[PDB]
Subunit: 131 residues, 2 copies
Amino acid sequence: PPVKGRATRQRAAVSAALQEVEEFRSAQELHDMLKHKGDAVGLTTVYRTLQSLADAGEVDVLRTAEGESVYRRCSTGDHHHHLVCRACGKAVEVEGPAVEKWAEAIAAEHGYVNVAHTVEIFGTCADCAGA
Amino acid sequence: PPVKGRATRQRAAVSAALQEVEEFRSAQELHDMLKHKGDAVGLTTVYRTLQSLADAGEVDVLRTAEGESVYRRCSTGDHHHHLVCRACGKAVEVEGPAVEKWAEAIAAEHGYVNVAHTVEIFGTCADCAGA
Ligand SMILES: [Zn+2]
Ligand SMILES: [Zn+2]
Ligand SMILES: [Zn+2]
Ligand SMILES: [Zn+2]
Ligand SMILES: [Zn+2]
Ligand SMILES: [Zn+2]
């Protein structure tokens, strides 16, 4: 995830941390993990970096049930949706043109100019049910 | 909108105020308009009664983009999704089988035991362009 400004070891470290993992996580959790592995990087610094990255779109955002935003550097850059298990945190890249066509159709029927769909599916793995 | 608690003027007043308005609105906005109407009801009371109603399923919840929560009453008791114009705040309920079929297919393919899909979509309506 290249940054608009000059690259610095803090930005490189947070980028390495983002690409290191695949689950969704907030600024606090990634701050914890980077400090524990030996980065010593600021909370507001990582917050600003992920704000800039989300503005660039290199990472994907998701508001949890409480409300806090979690972030995930997704491999696929095209339009896509994520199936997320809260017990595991794993994200599966799922995309369907049917929902996009439905959104376009309902927007046209209602005469709406632009459509910005917010779709998320929350579930549990089969292993989660098993003990 | 019956409330699980005993019959009191607070619950009746907040339920009537919610019924009168047909726009997604935050707890603070509901408290302010209730105060202006002369109810003189507490903000914590508004929050508690609103949470009780949301747990009862008689009301529809939604999370704002910035983080706050808005709530609205829809006449239909059946499951439905919402199109909400951020510029005006007006919300309209629709239902399309395609999202349900896609969710079922994804759950079957990935083996997820149970899933909970949230589909709330946003777009500007015609009067926004009109001047
Ligand atoms: Zn992705
Ligand atoms: Zn999509
Ligand atoms: Zn799981
Ligand atoms: Zn509704
Ligand atoms: Zn509008
Ligand atoms: Zn649905």
